[PDB]
Homo-oligomer: A and B are copies of this chain.
Amino acid sequence: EITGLFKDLTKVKHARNGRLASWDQRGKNQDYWEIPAGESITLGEIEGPGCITHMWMTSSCRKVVAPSILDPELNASAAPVMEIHPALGVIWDAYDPFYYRKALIKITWDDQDTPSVLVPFGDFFCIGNSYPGNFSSLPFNVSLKPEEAGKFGAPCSVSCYFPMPFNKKAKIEIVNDNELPFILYFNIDYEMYGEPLPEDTAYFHAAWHRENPCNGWGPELQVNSPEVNNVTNFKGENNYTVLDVEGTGHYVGCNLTVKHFQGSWWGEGNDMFFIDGEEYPSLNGTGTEDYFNHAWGMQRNAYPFFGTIVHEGDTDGFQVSYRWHITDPVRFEKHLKVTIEHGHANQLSDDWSSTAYWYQILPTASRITIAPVEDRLPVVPQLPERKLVLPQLTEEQQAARDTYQKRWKDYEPRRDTQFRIKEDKARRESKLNTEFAKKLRDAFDAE
């Protein structure tokens, strides 16, 4: 019979495809949702049994900061995003830099009293620090244009091929903690089965964590000084914690965002895994790039199971890295703690954040929680306050300032109205998505 990773293509399965999408249910060309400010919205609820097979998304979050000479009512029906340089003097929709950290993706299986995925939107899709990097790997990909790359909140395509099985229910939401709405395009593909999945079926989970600052004992000591390197750490009580979970399942990897402050090397710390409540780690690593399967630092490589998403050499002191344990998962029967020393022996006080991904049989024993939005924002240097004084104005300069202010007073409310109409579309299509997935479930089951 047929063998290898393509073999399943050579046998038919009696499963029915479905898809949750931001498709324009008016039949028009607004195939995205305007996710409202300070709201949660359901991309869809699907009745099991089924499996999520693919997610694609993209997003934009602009703030209107100047009056436009583009008719704002007609402009709402043109392309979704005014990719127009502010130097032309005709419009200014500024980029919201941290929207990837202000929104969360939230997934709840089988009507549990906790989500199983609760990760900032960016970090889930391997955008760390609300700062995309172009890369491919086996389960996650980002396609980022060079014209957009190298800034906070750059638009880009994200895709996820991790399978997410569910016997009874899938509820996918976005939690928007932003004061701004944002545009979200999505295609969530799944298949529905005509019988239950086995009860030892492991469900997809993901959780996010941040230590900022890490509680270092020697942040002011030079990394790799003899004094630092001769400190011992066996038990790793103060290690950065990527994952700490009770259940039966397996860890399939992480992304790690590190903003490093001393300008040496943030990565001497060892991975240390604690399986099934052991006091001392049974899996001991050698270094943080070593865990990410690089060496002598991180490289500008992104390989199927590991590598760099954003390289410290391209930024103001921050790195985004990933490793996938797809063929080499870290299994546990009762408990797993995944840790990394934050510098050798937890020397350093850098800004670490992470997404852990794992599969486990239900139930999800502990609530997956997330730090509040004020705790999820990248650390960025800020310009000194620049309290400008206007010179003595000519009548002409005052008339220009007055005329501009008047245009702005008229224009902003007109754009606000258009955002509210699109938000109304998203809330309407949220309910239609679920209603259609229910009709599809029932028509499949009748068959």
Contact between B3 and A5 (Cβ–Cβ < 8 Å)? no
- Contacts A9-B326, A16-B331, A327-B54 known; A78 to B273 CB distance under 8 Å? no
- The size of the chain A interface, using a CB distance under 8 A, is 175
- Contacts A6-B326, A11-B198 known; A31 to B285 CB distance under 8 Å? yes
Q: Which of B287, B328, B400 contacts A185 (CB 8 A)?
A: B287
* CB of A136 within 8 Å of the partner chain: yes
Contact between A23 and B285 (Cβ–Cβ < 8 Å)? yes
Enumerate chain B residues within 8 angstroms of A446, measured Cβ to Cβ.
none
Q: Which residue of B lies closest to A359 (CB)?
A: B9
Q: DSSP class of A's interface residues: helix, strand, loop or mixed?
A: loop
Contact between A301 and B248 (Cβ–Cβ < 8 Å)? no
In whole angstroms, what is the CA distance A293 to B198 when docked?
32
Q: Which residue of B lies closest to A289 (CB)?
A: B157
Q: Which residue of B lies closest to A1 (CB)?
A: B197
In whole angstroms, what is the CA distance A328 to B188 when docked?
11
Q: Which of B17, B138, B219, B328 contacts A388 (CB 8 A)?
A: B219
Enumerate chain B residues within 8 angstroms of A333, measured Cβ to Cβ.
14
* CB of A421 within 8 Å of the partner chain: no
Most buried by B among A54, A290, A349: A290
Enumerate chain B residues within 8 angstroms of A30, measured Cβ to Cβ.
229
Enumerate chain B residues within 8 angstroms of A15, measured Cβ to Cβ.
331
In whole angstroms, what is the CA distance A77 to B229 when docked?
6
Instruction: Identify the stretch in A114-122, A168-176, A262-270 within 8 Å (CB) of chain B at 4 or more residues.
Output: A262-270
Contact between B396 and A232 (Cβ–Cβ < 8 Å)? yes
Contact between A388 and B349 (Cβ–Cβ < 8 Å)? yes
* CB of A372 within 8 Å of the partner chain: no
Contact between A23 and B270 (Cβ–Cβ < 8 Å)? yes
Enumerate chain B residues within 8 angstroms of A383, measured Cβ to Cβ.
261, 379, 381-382
A2-36: CB near B (< 8 Å → 1, else 0) gives: 11111111111111111101111011111110000
In whole angstroms, what is the CA distance A394 to B19 when docked?
29
